[PDB]
């Protein structure tokens, strides 16, 4: 009177102790157990349990289902491991909404607020916004890096002459020895293995040593060098040329050549007395 | 007697075939179907389904509702696009816990283990922890990456000057001509178009040549050069200047002198015998 | 007659209006409130509710439910603030699985598909697969990133220190000074204040001021230089060095101690007639 259920089927059997059970073919053997439809069966003593549907099955201790061919299949479970979850959890039960051979989308579920709330679709969507934001960032950052790369390998391409030949397109030095060194105050040091020792001095060529205040030194002690190519000098403080000296040597030769006849003449004097 | 209804409305109708339903105003019109409170409709014959609460309603074939003016949306969905995924999903039912005007949440719930268990907002919380310490990474490279460009760029407004000058603020060659070629072992060759073909030699200015072991070229056949602003030579192996050859010049001058005045002697007596 | 319910406990108690309620002790208070078992309750203030298991508990406006001591835990809840939202949240209810102290795993889920669907552990692990392959992107970048470092450290290390000290390896000057300047066409300057004035010229050195087309200057007015460590000349323009020199003043010393001589014999001659 107030629970109509149309049937010709067999009776149900609320088996157990406390338990409730309504509809045709309904087998409730579990203490304090529910079930309701048609051949909703509460499997092995197994307690405490719900199934609300056609065919239903309550098989685990303590748990739910809900629906055609739904079963329990785990249960309450202690001490378990979740997925995305280092450290164990705990669990009074399950809520089975489908099957093994069969599951069942949930809908119309307000975003979860606190930690053990249902997390709806959107607020994964949320999530997944930024996932795509950075994967992008991501993207930029290998381009933009490779670029570098690129850049960067260029110096060592077109620079790499220069740190490593010591020279330029201009001031350039085959060798690979020790370093030039200007060690002088105001000096400059031209060429592998050059020294520049003295204040305002110059070391021009391969281990020349400038080593006296105020000079160019084309060599050293163990190693001079001729000068080449060299214009006459005309002012005071210029470099004279050997073709200029070879002028000199022939004014020389001119008199000494003068001498001797002066001296036969001399001769043919005191003689000639 | 043991499953009172306080009430005063209409008759319960378990209209269906095997059906069940309790309550005031309930028509469960669909086979086998369940259905318990004020009004809780099960409709069109579409089968097998559920609706426990004030105004409730099952729509859909296979599904549930619960609740306040809860309705089924959709249903079993087979070879559907789910949410994330990329392979088509099935589905043998839906489940409502609210409606398209008004929605659930769902309290208390352990994290899942398996693929197909409802998700808690702790067990994205640990997702979005790594999102984040993700985006920070992102934040740090973005800010070291500009910071490289930054390096780079100076690099290539210095280093350049260089390669296209072929100068340095101090080795300078105001020019456009052919690189300086230091040919010869520990050579030196300063200036477009010198050339150091000789062993341990020096290349001294544009278009100079240097040819000769052991050498420093002020220029070459084609155009010799004045050195110019040289000290007095000191040292055997100094170099010597114009004004200290006008010296020996002098003293050669001063000699002819002498010897024109002997010649006349020597004739004023010749001729005074 | 078709719900059967064994036990020798108390009455149920369908108290509220419209109510239903079935099993022992179970005491609905509530106006259209449904429950269903063992000692569960609908007190508090609970309009509407529903509890449907062993010693359930409905305790919040409008809410549910389900299974073994569980409890509604905060039920309808408007413009609330939800994990990951920005934007507030409406509710319409709450659907308890579970407790305060003991919670429920939701098994057997299909994947989401709208917004507000239940989602399930594997519609997560899809997210967490690329949270993973974006962190190994970025542990490359950051190992990348600290490779370019110390690639372009180095050139700084090597290259720059020229533009700072306008030295190369093999170039080298140890000054602070004015750059160096090369301002006549096709001329060289080296090393701080030189200045290469004139037409195909060279400056060598501190200070040093080349002002003459075809020149190459050690020095200036103001300063001269010796220069040092040269190899006697050979040929015609090649640079003579003191050596050299001191051989013809020893040949003119020579040439005056014989004029003397000859003066004297002339002088006695003279004299002695
Ligand atoms: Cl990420």
Do not use: C, W
């Not at 060098?225 to 005071?236: E, L």
């Amino acid at each position: 009177k107030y629970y109509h259920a149309n049937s010709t089927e067999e009776d149900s059997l609320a088996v157990g102790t406390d338990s409730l059970a309504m509809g045709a073919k309904t087998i409730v053997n579990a203490d304090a157990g529910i079930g309701i439809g048609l051949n909703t069966l509460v499997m092995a003593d197994a307690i405490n349990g719900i199934a609300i549907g056609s065919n239903a099955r309550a098989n685990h201790a303590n748990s739910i289902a809900m629906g055609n061919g739904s079963q329990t299949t785990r249960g309450a479970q202690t001490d378990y491991t979740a997925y995305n979850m280092d450290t164990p959890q705990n669990s009074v039960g399950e809520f089975s909404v489908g099957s093994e051979d069969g599951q069942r989308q949930i809908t119309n579920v307000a975003a979860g607020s606190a930690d053990t709330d249902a997390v709806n679709v959107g607020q994964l969507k949320v999530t997944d916004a930024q996932v795509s934001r950075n994967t992008q960032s991501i993207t930029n950052l290998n381009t933009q890096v490779s670029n570098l790369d690129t850049r960067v390998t260029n110096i060592e391409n077109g620079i790499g002459d220069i740190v490593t030949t010591g020279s330029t397109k201009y001031f350039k030095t085959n060798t690979d020895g020790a370093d030039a060194n200007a060690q002088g105050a105001d000096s400059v040091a031209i060429g592998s293995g050059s020294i520049a020792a003295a204040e305002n001095s110059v070391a021009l060529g391969t281990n020349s040593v400038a080593d006296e205040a105020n000079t160019v030194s084309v060599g050293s002690s163990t190693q001079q060098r001729r000068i080449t190519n060299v214009a006459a000098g005309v002012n005071n403080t210029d470099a004279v040329n050997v073709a200029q000296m070879k002028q000199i040597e022939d004014k020389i030769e001119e008199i000494l050549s003068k001498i001797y006849h002066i001296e036969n003449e001399i001769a043919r004097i005191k003689k000639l007395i």
